[PDB]
């Protein structure tokens, strides 16, 4: 074996120029795609508000134009998937994961158009789902497309270009280049076997994607939270405590998304029509609550500044947590196209500040700021449920830029994954590819 590795040690990182260059174009397309998707979600969201002003006296009629406007776009997105591409429901990260384990196709000729348009319907109606879900699966399939159209052969090329696509997807959805690379390296690579994924190439496309976004998105941060205070050593144990509660809740939240997947299938039975009207009902509740109580609906990125700044009561904070747990399940367990990441960031922060609020009142000697605990709980449900702590950590850091808090973010994150494991939880993307693979055999 020894002489074989002196051979291979000397051949390390020599990615084929063909794959390097193609990973450039994959990154550029996923960029424009994600940018396109983002502006479409935004534009539908504004026109629905401009409807609520055409109708701003008759509060009953207003509440109805709320419901119907989201119900329609919801259905349209629901319908697009079950008629033309059912593997584009939900997040789609798990599908792209199976594509890398070579047990699931990448039907780009169908998914790109349905996920894009079907997502815009459901996201642009204001249901609580993230841009991530669409972009990442849109980006993988743009990888597969670029592969087939140039007919590049070999296993490096297929798994690389599909990784670099799903990477550049997440990066473009969050403006987080490092988080994109770390997300495939930590979570999306095939996890039980060696692989041929060039990470120089993943890096090449992530760059391209991030510049694409920057061209059409300069000026404005997804999440502006300002520079918070520091964490004294003698306050660190408080974050390990915050971790443990994330690490018991983490698995319970997974239980709920899985059981509510079951529970909602019992409603429509699988019937393409009762399903699409069930999604019209969910969409419309979200567009109604969008008007009636915005902190319960939508992706969640807006309340993140407010909650970190301490500008919510704890009364309101408990309201939003229960409420957003509920809309989050109903939206993501129903199968609508749309990610689970960005609502898990919001869910996380609000619980985080609520801890900090209690913690501030209990130890004035610590000179706490209730908002640092918010930053440390943002990627904490990502750690406890997705079991991608290193990705949540760098994702939260890329978005909120308070590096002075890296230690407490780590400490809450590790405690989340640690108690997640020791409590008996399973990685949630893994536990649903599992189930779609478990039926993709139990029908034989």
């Amino acid at each position, epitope marked *: 074996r020894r002489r074989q590795l002196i051979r291979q040690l000397l051949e390390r990182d020599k990615t084929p120029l063909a794959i390097l260059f193609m990973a450039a174009v994959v990154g550029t397309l996923v960029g424009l795609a994600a940018v396109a998707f983002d502006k479409g979600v935004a534009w539908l969201q504004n026109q629905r508000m401009g409807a609520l002003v055409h109708t701003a006296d008759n509060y009953p009629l207003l509440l109805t134009v709320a419901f119907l406007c989201s119900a329609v776009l919801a259905m349209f997105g629901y319908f697009l998937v079950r008629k033309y591409a059912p593997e584009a429901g939900g997040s789609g990260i798990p599908e792209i994961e199976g594509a890398l384990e070579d047990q699931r196709p990448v039907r780009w000729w169908r998914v790109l158009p349905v996920k894009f348009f079907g997502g815009l319907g459901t996201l642009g109606g204001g249901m609580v789902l993230g841009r991530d879900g669409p972009t990442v699966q849109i980006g993988g399939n743009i990888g597969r497309m670029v592969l087939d159209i140039f007919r590049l052969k070999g296993d490096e090329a297929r798994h690389t270009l599909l990784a670099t696509g799903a990477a550049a997807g997440l990066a473009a959805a969050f403006n987080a280049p490092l988080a994109g690379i770390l997300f495939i390296i930590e979570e999306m690579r095939p996890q039980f076997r060696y692989t041929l994924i060039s990470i120089k190439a993943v890096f090449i496309g992530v760059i391209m994607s991030t510049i694409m976004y920057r061209i059409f998105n300069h000026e404005v941060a997804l999440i502006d939270v300002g520079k918070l*205070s520091d964490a*004294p*050593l*003698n*306050t660190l144990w408080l974050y390990l405590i915050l971790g443990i509660i994330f690490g018991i809740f983490g698995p319970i939240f997974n239980k709920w998304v899985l059981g509510m997947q079951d529970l909602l299938h019992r409603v429509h039975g699988g019937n393409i029509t009762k399903w699409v009207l069930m999604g019209g009902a969910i969409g419309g509740l979200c567009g109604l609550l969008g008007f009636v109580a915005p902190a319960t609906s939508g992706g969640g990125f807006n309340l993140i500044p407010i909650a970190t700044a*301490g500008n919510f009561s704890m009364g309101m904070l408990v309201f939003i947590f229960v409420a957003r747990v509920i809309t989050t399940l109903l939206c993501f367990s129903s199968g609508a196209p749309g990610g689970i990441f960005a609502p898990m960031l919001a869910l996380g922060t609000v619980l985080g500040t609520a801890f900090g609020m209690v913690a*501030v009142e209990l*130890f*004035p*000697q*610590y*000179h706490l*700021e209730a908002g640092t605990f918010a930053i440390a709980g943002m990627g904490a449900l990502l750690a406890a449920s997705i079991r991608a702590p290193l990705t949540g950590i760098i994702l939260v850091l890329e978005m909120t830029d308070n590096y002075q808090l890296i230690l407490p973010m780590i400490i809450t994150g590790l405690g989340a994954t640690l108690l997640a494991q020791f409590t008996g939880g399973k990685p949630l993307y893994s536990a649903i590819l599992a189930r779609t693979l478990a039926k993709q055999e139990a029908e034989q």
Partner: antibody
Amino acid sequence: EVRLLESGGGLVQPGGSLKLSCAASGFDYSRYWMSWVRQAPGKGLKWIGEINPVSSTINYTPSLKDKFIISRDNAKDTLYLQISKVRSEDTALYYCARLYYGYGYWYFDVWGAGTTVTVSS
Amino acid sequence: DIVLTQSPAIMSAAPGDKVTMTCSASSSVSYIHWYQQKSGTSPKRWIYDTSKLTSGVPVRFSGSGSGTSYSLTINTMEAEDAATYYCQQWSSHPQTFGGGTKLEILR
């Protein structure tokens, strides 16, 4: 260097009120908790209160309602203390301080020269 | 709240000689600080977290303690060590100083 300059102390008649001032130079007066400690005629140091850089937190020592009122104007880089209903117990050299920590056990980092308040008829 | 009581409320000692102050707390306290004060001038931070000197404070000075008894000592005293040394706590809220001990030259 770092400079803390208190003004505003003088003679006050009992039951009156005053407003002492503390002017900060040589450092970013934001990012720091500020504090007030007074030392009575020949006795020990006693903590009045403190204010966080954003004025979202203001904690006082055990003592009545409008007692003292700490406030800060990071725009002009000065810290304030209003005392009301001044009794003779309030005759004291009043110190302004900047707070910090090491392991997280907070301490009184840099102090000013002080001002004296005499309350007397 | 915590009550710090410093031991030799007042005391003299000759230069080049080893002195030792005490700080004794009603309940338990962690990482105590010590301020030197000489008349007419603001208190100075001297020793913080039970043990660490401030940048400038010469190395003769030192402190140590745990739980409920703490101390400051001056291996070789100078003449300029004449001042009042206030121990102070913030392990608990609210924070409390001690009474002080004044240290004067002996001649």
